[PDB]
């Protein structure tokens, strides 16, 4: 039962209470959108190469999520919150350092009067410097449910560091609850998957939401489960609770609501039914 399964998961959280001390440091307080939502220390993305005048330059509210313990970076994700005004530069340091080539944005910049992500990309055709990083917005391609932005990211002053980063911005997720059917998300995730698959040396896919746990966990868990079906077929074992437990061992609270939990099952079933057609 969906209701019983999600409740059992919500109770099991007491054994994934790993340290979150770095995000609790005074220097990092203003780098978190939400005081209570912090990365586990052992899976957090540690930022190197920071300004040597900054006493703490190694922190972003983000964790690596591996679907399996041996996963390559190309098969992994970074779950993170939407940028704050003061973390846009750190976000691009993270994207560059981790060799990420695909970003999945699951919110608008603002929903119901609240900032869910400060704009971290230039206007179409424009060039912006974000700290030491330079970003050109080469082209935007607008679909029904999402916009794709082809971004070119490089380190200022250093040639031959340029790489293309593809930002898939899902724009129609409802302000409350979840989409009433998963077709839009499934089509979006299919494009994300093929783009990531096509890039030889790609690092983890960056996925973000206001806190980096609810919509972020929903998209990541759907993506993991559909990839199992890609490899193993429509009759394979699918274990939604165990997959949620795996991602929750790497960032607290992934998948926040019962509607999200039901949406994951619905997305997987629709993926299966399109294949069977």
């Amino acid at each position: 039962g969906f209701w019983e399964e999600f409740e059992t998961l919500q109770q099991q959280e007491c054994k994934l209470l790993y340290s979150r001390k770095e995000g609790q440091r005074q220097e990092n307080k203003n780098k978190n959108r939400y005081k209570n939502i912090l990365p586990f220390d052992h899976t957090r993305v540690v930022l190197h190469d920071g300004d040597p005048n900054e006493p703490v330059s190694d922190y972003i509210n983000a964790n690596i999520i591996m679907p399996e313990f041996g996963s390559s970076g190309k098969k992994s994700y970074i779950a993170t919150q939407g940028c704050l005004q003061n973390t846009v530069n750190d976000f691009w340091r993270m994207v560059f350092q981790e060799n990420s080539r695909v970003i999945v944005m699951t919110t608008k910049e603002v929903e119901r009067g609240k900032s869910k992500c400060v704009k971290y990309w230039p206007d179409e055709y424009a060039l912006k410097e974000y700290g030491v990083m330079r970003v050109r917005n080469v082209k935007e391609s607008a679909a029904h449910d999402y916009t794709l932005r082809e971004l070119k990211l490089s380190k200022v002053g250093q040639g031959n560091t340029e790489r293309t980063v593809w930002q898939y911005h899902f724009r129609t997720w409802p302000d409350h609850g979840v989409p009433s059917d998963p077709g839009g998300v499934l089509d979006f995730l299919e494009e994300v998957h093929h783009k990531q698959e096509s890039i030889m040396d790609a690092g983890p896919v960056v996925v973000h939401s206001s806190a980096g746990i609810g919509r972020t966990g929903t998209f990541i868990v759907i993506d993991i489960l559909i990839d199992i079906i890609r490899e193993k077929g429509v009759d394979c074992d699918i274990d939604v609770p165990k997959t949620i437990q795996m991602v929750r061992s790497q960032r607290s609270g992934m998948v926040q609501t019962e509607a999200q939990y039901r949406f994951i099952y619905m997305a997987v079933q629709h993926y299966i039914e399109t294949l069977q057609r």
Binding site: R33, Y34, K35, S210, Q256
Partner: peptide, 6 residues
Amino acid sequence: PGEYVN
């Protein structure tokens, strides 16, 4: 910073 309870 605030509190995410969704």
